[PDB]
Write a protein that holds these residues in place. Structure first.
Motif, mmCIF file in Angstrom:
data_model
loop_
_atom_site.group_PDB
_atom_site.id
_atom_site.type_symbol
_atom_site.label_atom_id
_atom_site.label_comp_id
_atom_site.label_asym_id
_atom_site.label_seq_id
_atom_site.Cartn_x
_atom_site.Cartn_y
_atom_site.Cartn_z
ATOM 1 N N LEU A 286 14.681 -1.338 13.757
ATOM 2 C CA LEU A 286 13.291 -1.673 13.976
ATOM 3 C C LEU A 286 12.435 -0.743 13.033
ATOM 4 C CD1 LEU A 286 11.134 -3.135 15.604
ATOM 5 C CD2 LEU A 286 10.946 -1.654 17.084
ATOM 6 N N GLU A 287 12.756 0.705 13.288
ATOM 7 C CA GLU A 287 11.827 1.778 12.438
ATOM 8 C C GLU A 287 11.966 1.479 10.958
ATOM 9 O OE1 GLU A 287 12.132 5.840 13.244
ATOM 10 O OE2 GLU A 287 11.990 6.330 11.197
ATOM 11 N N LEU A 288 13.076 0.963 10.446
ATOM 12 C CA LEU A 288 13.201 0.840 9.179
ATOM 13 C C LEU A 288 12.687 -0.662 8.634
ATOM 14 C CD1 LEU A 288 17.256 1.762 8.696
ATOM 15 C CD2 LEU A 288 15.603 2.506 7.071
ATOM 16 N N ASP A 289 12.686 -1.397 9.337
ATOM 17 C CA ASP A 289 11.776 -2.695 9.120
ATOM 18 C C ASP A 289 10.516 -2.659 9.069
ATOM 19 O OD1 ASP A 289 11.589 -5.703 8.735
ATOM 20 O OD2 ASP A 289 11.219 -5.753 10.842
ATOM 21 N N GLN A 290 10.023 -1.754 10.049
ATOM 22 C CA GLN A 290 8.572 -1.723 10.427
ATOM 23 C C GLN A 290 7.838 -0.745 9.382
ATOM 24 N N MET A 291 8.493 0.315 9.225
ATOM 25 C CA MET A 291 7.942 1.225 7.939
ATOM 26 C C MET A 291 8.692 1.992 6.989
ATOM 27 S SD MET A 291 6.451 4.045 10.882
ATOM 28 C CE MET A 291 7.438 4.449 12.113
ATOM 29 N N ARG A 292 10.096 2.344 7.684
ATOM 30 C CA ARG A 292 10.750 3.330 6.715
ATOM 31 C C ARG A 292 11.419 2.734 5.435
ATOM 32 N NH1 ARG A 292 15.747 6.610 6.842
ATOM 33 N NH2 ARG A 292 16.258 5.420 8.805
ATOM 34 N N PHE A 293 11.808 1.357 5.271
ATOM 35 C CA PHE A 293 12.168 0.996 4.211
ATOM 36 C C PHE A 293 10.849 1.013 3.092
ATOM 37 C CE2 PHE A 293 15.606 -2.070 6.110
ATOM 38 C CZ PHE A 293 16.518 -1.526 5.781
ATOM 39 N N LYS A 294 9.697 0.840 3.455
ATOM 40 C CA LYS A 294 8.651 0.804 2.689
ATOM 41 C C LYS A 294 8.264 2.274 2.223
ATOM 42 C CE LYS A 294 4.568 -0.984 1.145
ATOM 43 N NZ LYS A 294 4.371 -2.064 0.053
ATOM 44 N N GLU A 295 8.445 3.365 3.134
ATOM 45 C CA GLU A 295 8.564 4.519 3.222
ATOM 46 C C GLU A 295 9.358 4.860 1.940
ATOM 47 O OE1 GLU A 295 9.170 7.028 6.693
ATOM 48 O OE2 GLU A 295 7.297 7.864 6.277
ATOM 49 N N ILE A 296 10.699 4.606 1.951
ATOM 50 C CA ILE A 296 11.775 4.857 0.972
ATOM 51 C C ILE A 296 11.326 4.245 -0.437
ATOM 52 C CG2 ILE A 296 14.280 4.660 0.381
ATOM 53 C CD1 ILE A 296 14.721 4.551 3.463
ATOM 54 N N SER A 297 11.118 2.908 -0.189
ATOM 55 C CA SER A 297 10.395 2.369 -1.471
ATOM 56 C C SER A 297 9.378 2.709 -2.255
ATOM 57 C CB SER A 297 10.209 0.853 -1.295
ATOM 58 O OG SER A 297 9.799 0.302 -2.522
ATOM 59 N N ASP A 298 8.218 3.443 -1.474
ATOM 60 C CA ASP A 298 7.214 3.818 -2.089
ATOM 61 C C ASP A 298 7.428 5.148 -2.830
ATOM 62 O OD1 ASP A 298 5.340 1.788 -1.523
ATOM 63 O OD2 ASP A 298 4.728 2.634 0.361
ATOM 64 N N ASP A 299 8.343 5.770 -2.040
ATOM 65 C CA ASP A 299 8.759 7.233 -2.709
ATOM 66 C C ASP A 299 9.537 7.042 -4.228
ATOM 67 N N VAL A 300 10.252 6.051 -4.166
ATOM 68 C CA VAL A 300 10.976 5.590 -5.437
ATOM 69 C C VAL A 300 10.061 5.413 -6.441
ATOM 70 C CG1 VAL A 300 12.528 4.064 -6.532
ATOM 71 C CG2 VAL A 300 13.114 4.991 -4.148
ATOM 72 N N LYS A 301 9.076 4.605 -6.163
ATOM 73 C CA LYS A 301 7.988 4.157 -7.052
ATOM 74 C C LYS A 301 6.987 5.126 -7.524
ATOM 75 C CE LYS A 301 7.197 -0.615 -5.525
ATOM 76 N N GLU A 302 6.741 6.124 -6.687
ATOM 77 C CA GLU A 302 6.318 7.303 -7.131
ATOM 78 C C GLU A 302 6.995 8.313 -8.140
ATOM 79 O OE1 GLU A 302 2.459 9.061 -7.018
ATOM 80 O OE2 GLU A 302 3.338 7.618 -5.135
ATOM 81 N N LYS A 303 8.303 8.421 -7.676
ATOM 82 C CA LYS A 303 9.197 9.071 -8.799
ATOM 83 C C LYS A 303 9.406 8.569 -9.956
ATOM 84 N N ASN A 304 9.370 7.291 -10.057
ATOM 85 C CA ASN A 304 9.488 6.363 -11.244
ATOM 86 C C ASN A 304 8.266 6.799 -12.142
ATOM 87 O OD1 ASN A 304 12.092 5.478 -10.888
ATOM 88 N ND2 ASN A 304 10.995 3.512 -10.030
ATOM 89 N N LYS A 305 7.118 7.103 -11.717
ATOM 90 C CA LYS A 305 5.861 7.292 -12.233
ATOM 91 C C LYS A 305 5.829 8.571 -13.112
#
Length: 433
Positions: free
Chosen positions: A193-212
């Motif tokens: 539930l926590e992964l679906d609601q926020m933490r998948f997005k939190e992980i994904s956003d951190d990856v996009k940020e590192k890719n910058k």
């Protein structure tokens, strides 16, 4: 229908599919048997532990350097079929997708949840429903009820916990299984539930940020190769025949003499015999040519490149240092390296051959070499992708120019979290120009 099949995956959150897409993960829909697909004897195990030959099944996550999720087009109205597709997608995330495949099963959140499920009660009688719902056969025989899971148990039995993650994932996203997950394994429902609601997005956003900040392909070859070839095409089209020949030669028999020459004299009245002079002059002309070639090529982005090495990285005095024994990286020895070498530098008098992908070759990576150099090359450094011209294909070589100075920044121990680590830990050492 292919649409009916597409629609099924498109129900999964955008964030899960972005994480897969970021590592070159691809999704194929096919009317043919799986084994007739170009991406692909083997047997698989379904979410409920049934074995089938691969050619008889309708969904498969292919792992490795170029992950693929192959899906046979079925109607998928049946929930018994749909859940297997979400299960394989769950495996492709927890097994094949950075950073989840290195970090998540060791996370406190995963370990907390799984223990809470291994400890459910109906002095209350012990409750096995969570175990029955989510744990495979071999896990239940190796983990009893009320027994504590730790980082160690997870590392020795990795595929068994990947399954628990994948099955939780599948039951959560498949709407007619979600309520059974909630009822029979609440701690793991909450974890998902926590992964679906926020933490998948939190992980994904951190990856996009590192890719910058920095381009890093890790061990994923699909996106690396395309970038190597396209970004250095122009440079390669402007090489002369001599430049191209010696680049090729450097990946073969011309390497040792050039490297010995550069290391010996760090980049008087006696004369040499005819043969030693001719050989010395040839070498000099090779170096002139490599130099000229690499001077025309500037790396356009901050880039990570990789190099596997033995303890001899740190000098002759580290001969039989035995950093690694029985695949365990020695924590005390790593602290001596950190103390002596962190923030120190070395000049690289020879050219520096590196890989655009981490560990492209199994015979020349983790089982042989206990140290990975992760090397940050800032924009403007002279170097180029030479893999097409290599005498040893499949190595994704980035050739950096000679004479740069490199600094040791960070020393990290890495647990075996991938089948491709072969059970053995390693020391990851970050270097910069």
């Amino acid at each position: 229908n292919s649409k009916k099949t597409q629609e099924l995956v498109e129900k999964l959150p955008h964030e899960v599919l972005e994480l897969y897409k970021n590592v070159g993960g691809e999704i194929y829909i096919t009317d043919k048997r799986l084994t007739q697909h170009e991406e692909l004897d083997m047997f698989i195990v379904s979410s409920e532990g049934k074995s089938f030959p691969l050619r008889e099944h309708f969904v498969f996550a292919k792992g490795g350097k170029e992950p693929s999720l192959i899906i046979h087009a079925e109607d998928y109205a049946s929930h018994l079929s749909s859940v297997e597709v979400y299960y394989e997608l769950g495996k492709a995330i927890i097994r094949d997708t950075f950073p989840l495949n290195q970090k998540e099963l060791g996370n406190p959140k995963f370990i907390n949840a799984i223990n809470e499920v291994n400890q459910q009660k109906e002095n209350a009688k012990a409750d096995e429903d969570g175990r029955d719902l989510l744990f495979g056969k071999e896990l239940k025989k190796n983990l009893e009820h009320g027994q504590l899971v730790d980082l160690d148990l997870i590392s020795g039995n990795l595929s068994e916990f990947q399954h628990v993650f994948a099955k939780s994932f599948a039951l959560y996203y498949e709407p007619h299984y979600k309520e059974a997950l909630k009822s029979y394994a609440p701690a793991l429902f909450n974890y998902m539930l926590e992964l679906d609601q926020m933490r998948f997005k939190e992980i994904s956003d951190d990856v996009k940020e590192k890719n910058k900040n920095v381009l890093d392909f890790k061990w994923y070859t699909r996106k690396a190769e395309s970038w190597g070839v396209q970004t250095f095409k122009n440079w390669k089209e402007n090489l002369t025949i001599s430049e191209k020949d010696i680049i090729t030669g450097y990946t073969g028999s011309k390497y040792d003499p050039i490297n010995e020459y550069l290391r010996k004299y760090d980049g008087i009245g006696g004369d040499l015999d005819k043969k030693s002079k001719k050989a010395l002059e040839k070498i000099e002309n090779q170096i002139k040519n490599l130099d000229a070639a690499l001077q025309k090529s500037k790396i356009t982005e901050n880039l990570i490149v990789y190099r596997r090495v033995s303890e001899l990285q740190f000098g002759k005095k580290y001969e039989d240092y035995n950093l690694r024994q029985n695949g365990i990286i020695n924590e005390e020895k790593v602290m001596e390296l950190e103390s002596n070498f962190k923030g120190q530098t070395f000049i690289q008098h020879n050219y520096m051959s590196t890989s655009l992908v981490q560990d492209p070759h199994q015979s020349y990576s983790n089982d042989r070499y206990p140290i990975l150099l992760e090397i940050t090359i800032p924009e403007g450094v002279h170097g180029a992708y030479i893999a097409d011209m290599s005498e040893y294909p499949g190595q994704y070589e980035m050739l950096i120019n000679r004479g740069y100075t490199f600094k040791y920044d960070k020393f990290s121990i890495v647990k075996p979290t991938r089948e491709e680590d072969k059970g053995k830990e390693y020391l990851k050492v970050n270097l910069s120009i």
